[PDB]
UniProtKB/Swiss-Prot annotation, chain A:
This is DNA-directed RNA polymerase subunit beta'. Disulfide bonds: none annotated. Coiled coil: none annotated. Co-administration of salinamide and rifampicin or salinamide and myxopyronin suppresses the emergence of resistance to both antibiotics. DNA-dependent RNA polymerase (RNAP) catalyzes the transcription of DNA into RNA using the four ribonucleoside triphosphates as substrates. Resistance to the antibiotics salinamide A, salinamide B, rifampicin, streptolydigin, CBR703, myxopyronin, and lipiarmycin can result from mutations in this protein. Acetylated on several lysine residues in the presence of glucose. The chain holds residues 593 to 642 of 1407 of the full protein.
Curated annotation (Swiss-Prot), chain F:
Sigma factors are initiation factors that promote the attachment of RNA polymerase to specific initiation sites and are then released. This sigma factor is responsible for the expression of enzymes involved in arginine catabolism. The open complex (sigma-54 and core RNA polymerase) serves as the receptor for the receipt of the melting signal from the remotely bound activator protein GlnG(NtrC). The chain holds residues 112 to 189 of 477 of the full protein. Belongs to the sigma-54 factor family. Coiled coil: none annotated. Transmembrane segments: none annotated. This is RNA polymerase sigma-54 factor. The lineage of its organism: Bacteria, Pseudomonadati, Pseudomonadota, Gammaproteobacteria, Enterobacterales. It comes from the Bacteria.
From Swiss-Prot, chain G:
Acetylated on several lysine residues in the presence of glucose. It comes from the Bacteria. Belongs to the RNA polymerase beta' chain family. Zn(2+) 2 binds at C25, C99, C106, C109. DNA-dependent RNA polymerase (RNAP) catalyzes the transcription of DNA into RNA using the four ribonucleoside triphosphates as substrates. The RNAP catalytic core consists of 2 alpha, 1 beta, 1 beta' and 1 omega subunit. When a sigma factor is associated with the core the holoenzyme is formed, which can initiate transcription. The rRNA transcription and antitermination complex (rrnTAC) consists of RNAP, NusA, NusB, NusE (rpsJ), NusG, SubB, ribosomal protein S4, DNA and precursor rRNA; S4 is more flexible than other subunits. This is DNA-directed RNA polymerase subunit beta'. Co-administration of salinamide and rifampicin or salinamide and myxopyronin suppresses the emergence of resistance to both antibiotics.
UniProtKB/Swiss-Prot annotation, chain H:
It comes from Escherichia coli (strain K12). Gene3D superfamilies: 5' to 3' exonuclease, C-terminal subdomain, DNA-directed RNA polymerase, insert domain, RNA polymerase, RBP11-like subunit. Residues 1-218 are annotated as: Alpha N-terminal domain (alpha-NTD). GO terms for biological process: bacterial-type flagellum assembly; bacterial-type flagellum-dependent cell motility; cell motility; cellular response to cell envelope stress; DNA-templated transcription initiation; intracellular iron ion homeostasis; nitrate assimilation; regulation of DNA-templated transcription elongation. The lineage of its organism: Bacteria, Pseudomonadati, Pseudomonadota, Gammaproteobacteria, Enterobacterales. Keywords: Acetylation, ADP-ribosylation, DNA-directed RNA polymerase, Nucleotidyltransferase, Transcription, Transferase. The N-terminal domain is essential for RNAP assembly and basal transcription, whereas the C-terminal domain is involved in interaction with transcriptional regulators (such as CRP) and with upstream promoter elements. This is DNA-directed RNA polymerase subunit alpha.
Amino acid sequence: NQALGKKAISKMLNTCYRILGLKPTVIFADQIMYTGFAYAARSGASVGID
Amino acid sequence: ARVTVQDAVEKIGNRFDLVLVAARRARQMQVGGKDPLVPEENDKTTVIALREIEEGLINNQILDVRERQEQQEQEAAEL
Amino acid sequence: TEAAVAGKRDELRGLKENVIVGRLIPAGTGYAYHQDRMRRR
Amino acid sequence: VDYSGRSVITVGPYLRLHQCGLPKKMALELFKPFIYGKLELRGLATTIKAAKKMVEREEAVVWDILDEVIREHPVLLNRAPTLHRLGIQAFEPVLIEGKAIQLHPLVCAAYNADFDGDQMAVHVPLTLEAQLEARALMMSTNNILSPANGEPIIVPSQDVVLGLYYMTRDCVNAKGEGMVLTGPKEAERLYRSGLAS
Amino acid sequence: EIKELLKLGDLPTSGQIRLYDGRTGEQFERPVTVGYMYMLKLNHLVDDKMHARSTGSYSLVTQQPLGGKAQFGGQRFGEMEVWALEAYGAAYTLQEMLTVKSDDVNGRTKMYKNIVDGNHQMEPGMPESFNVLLKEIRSLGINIELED
Amino acid sequence: YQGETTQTLQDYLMWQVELTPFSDTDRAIATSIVDAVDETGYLTVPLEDILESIGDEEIDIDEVEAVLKRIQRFDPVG
Amino acid sequence: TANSGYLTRRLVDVAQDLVVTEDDCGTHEGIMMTPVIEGGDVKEPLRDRVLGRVTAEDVLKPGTADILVPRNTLLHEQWCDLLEENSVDAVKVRSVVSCDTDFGVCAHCYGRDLARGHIINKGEAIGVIAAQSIGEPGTQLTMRT
Amino acid sequence: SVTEFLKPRLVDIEQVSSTHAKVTLEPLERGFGHTLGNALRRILLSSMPGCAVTEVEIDGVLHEYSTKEGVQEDILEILLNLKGLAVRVQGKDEVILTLNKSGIGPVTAADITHDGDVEIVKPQHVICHLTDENASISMRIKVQRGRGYVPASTRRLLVDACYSPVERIAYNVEAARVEQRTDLDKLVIEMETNGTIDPEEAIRRAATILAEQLEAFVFDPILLRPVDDLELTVRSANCLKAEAIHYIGDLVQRTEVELLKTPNLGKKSLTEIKDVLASRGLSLGMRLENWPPAS
Amino acid sequence: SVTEFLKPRLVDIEQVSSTHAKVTLEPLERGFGHTLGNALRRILLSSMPGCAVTEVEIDGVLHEYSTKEGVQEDILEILLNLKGLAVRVQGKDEVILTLNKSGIGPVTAADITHDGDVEIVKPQHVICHLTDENASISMRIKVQRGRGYVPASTRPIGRLLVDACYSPVERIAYNVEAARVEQRTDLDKLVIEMETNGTIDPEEAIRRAATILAEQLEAFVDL
Amino acid sequence: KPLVGTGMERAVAVDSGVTAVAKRGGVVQYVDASRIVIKVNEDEMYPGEAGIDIYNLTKYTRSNQNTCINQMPCVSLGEPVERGDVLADGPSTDLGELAL
Ligand SMILES: [Mg+2]
Ligand SMILES: [Zn+2]
């Protein structure tokens, strides 16, 4: 429930590892990668001169 | 297949003894005449051995006891 | 030269000596193997 | 050493971090004695030279044999220089078409590898103890913490965090705001349907 | 002046147009930068990089696999990769890369025969490049020998 | 300079002898049979010289012929 | 690029054959872990200098006789949270240098694995791991400057 | 040959056994996975006929947010609980129900007055929690037939109308291979419904709608031969027949020591068997995975 | 009612040029314009049948890395020019055309010997140039029907192979806009603008796309 | 062609002798995929000389890097030429301009 930068994502995986275990952490990492890729592509971000 | 071996490590207790126990059981299943204690699902001998270790069916003491029993029965049968 | 003039002897106890010869290093899964050798020696 | 190859690495975003992408023309060479044994085990070849010829001319059944023999058999991927022990990791092969190895993104930080011309070397564990050491010790899903300090080494890096940052943000007067939803499923159903931002 | 050229031919001044997704057919949420860039094809082809080996020709004095792609050689497993296997604790994976897969002459054939036979087990033996070291050390007038 | 190991005809024949399901005595007989093969592929000694080179009293010429008929269908055939 | 390689080669060669060969050497001497203070700022808190080690003495509380933790404990995350709740002062811990085991180290002087959360196992080669850990970041340090 | 395409063959729909299903179809032509999946998902999300609650009218409440005595949930909480109420009307296209109730137990969907046309799929669905004994709740709930999602902001207390029987659908396209062709498609559709219809029926109805929208344009041979092929002598053939070896594949797997123990079979007779088997490039120590090929 | 959808029909077809057309489909419900437009665009861009040049055989050449006396282009450039030849055959799945030319000048697609079934849609397609007074070119071109893109590598010492791109269409663009049908105002209208090479009818292309979509969709109706 | 350049393409293309630059001005009298024959002007000819320049193009030769070297004409039959302008392109050259 916040804007997830790069430090707010690593702490999420660390919390998952410390609370749950190893298998949920692996599945969570794969799902995080998939969702991040999908919505980064869907956002249509770019870079211009303006 | 499988992705993690954490349960087998917890049951055996050490990550270096698990490899040896699993190798012993997998060699028993592969080059010997043994058959898996769990339903094999298109799996190889190493993964079957790991799945047997995960359920408390295989460890060093069980293997030693079964080997001694097999040797005693074979020596009795040969007479 | 200094190991020859002194007649030294190597017991193959480390990790780099079992790699030159091609044995199991006494660190990982080869620790119990070397424990057996030291026990039966 | 024998049973070893190398080639250029590309990216596969569809993988799971316990598997890699191996060309099917490299795995045919790396796994050749296994293919001979599997061929003459099931009666396809009654001699070693018959299996040798079948593999040489690349019939249509040697690919099924290869898919059977590479099922659960880790391969060690290594990239030089090997500065720490995370530079060699064991993955499960997936037979792909092409000449480039496909590497999972999340494992790029450990290798210090980027896809602008890097190359990797693949090694095949042979014995029954090497296949279990590559699965219980060197597997990619086993080392997710750094042995130097104890912090995770599988952190998302650049455009995995950009998408999660863009998705988890707020705007003052975005479309369809202020409504009361009944769960995440309704939120996704509104987003896909275009009724909300 | 780029923005004057982008107005001479009727194009957006910003240099960014809106794009649609080819698979779903829905517009990307933000404008993206499209244009024409001059691309080169460098002389690093993946056809000249891919290599593989299972068994081939070995050297004479030290019977190890040759090096290179034109000689159907093997990949070098150097010192820094031995350190990484010593740090994991992989003793068998390290032992099979020093004797069976590289140098032990009588173990290579046994391993190949066992792999073809469906039995994955090795008889380690002794590397053939340590006997060369012993013969070269004791040709200097120094009596080095294995005992017991 | 070190060199390179080339594969001759006898090395190729041995590579197949070791991969053939022989027995301990059959492989010993096959070693003698493959040893007495010149560069043209023809056996250069009579089978009575191979039966003598084995150095065993219980082996008969029938076993030597049986092993020879199997070696004769290696690669190359003949 | 080359100086770091030479340094890590020397580090590996000096400590190649150090292996955890025991479980307890029977001595409880050790070092005292105090936070680093250059004079104006606390560079590193004490929660990172003791996380995953074994105490060498009775470290309970400065006040009186209130045993918060026993003589030999593995200070994991929960124990460190308890440490920060009560504002725990300097602690004495067992270090590798002050170990009574000959030809190796024991699993209690060393501490945590730092790759798995548990305590270090017998056999694991710690000298190579430490040499690679020190020598790997050597390419991020300035050479000429 | 130019107008024929691959068709799915391995459809293996898997049930989570109540309202959640995962259907896998393979192999599609390259690129048809995205086409079919996106079309089906868009049709299921946007246009699927159904019946849903449109608006409510509580006697004691005249505002979207207010205070109602004796109810634990807020007014918008009651609206949320009514939004998820799944109804299956048969005859009409607009009906009205009443929820007069009093007591201390929770007020659930089973407390609605019965109608012949109206059917409730989850009587266990809880609408509100009444706490005070003297408290009572009586409201009128109207349901109507429509398609898709209609927010209240597009247009008594208004409720967002979810006519479509779908709650979530997601498709995923993976790589599949036919024996020769390298790049094909494998479509995996995972979907859930609100209980009024099964997932497979919703998929069938979406496919029917889309297809009706287009009506204006549409071993080795040697091992199999009988052991009689060999030029065996009388005694060796009789011993093999007595050993029930009717094929070369059976004889080949028999190891030498096992055949030595065979009665009436000698060393010189075993050597003849080995000779006649070797004259065909065969030995006596071969292994076969599963020999008898149902023949 | 609510379970009754108005179904579209091919209303208008506008031939803007020989290789450009705009077809119209209306009336459409809400959300069906984008449902049909992208599906038809993908099917048109991926699954259309056509005819392509596959093999060439020039009289006096051995390989495509050579030159001819009197011809300004290399054989490789002649093959690359023959790749773009747009041809419509109407009776078979394979035909052989013949080209004989002599004298100074261009050798266009109008110099191919006339055949009853074969139709050349762009007779101004320049293949090569003859720059010599006594120079002749004689070639036998093989044309066959297929779909997709088949390189020569995947599939005599004088027969030259060329990669075959069988797809007629070049680009597709669809637009959804409001339509005026009866009294309802929620109905839409889909306009599909397509650029082919001139060797396929727009209406039959739309009908082929719809037939492919329906026959692929029939696997879900039973399930 | 780059379509966005700096103007140094022509100098690099001409100075490196991969093209075919006319030695004397004239009129192209023969154009072929492997040779060009130029009829030199009357005011650039030596006494007692048949004025023609013959350029033999390099076709599919192998370079030191196992690549291809191939020159293609860029002139037409019967068109004027002057001294110093290109007659045939080279590897990575488009009308006398560098194109990589
Ligand atoms: Mg790089
Ligand atoms: Zn100690």
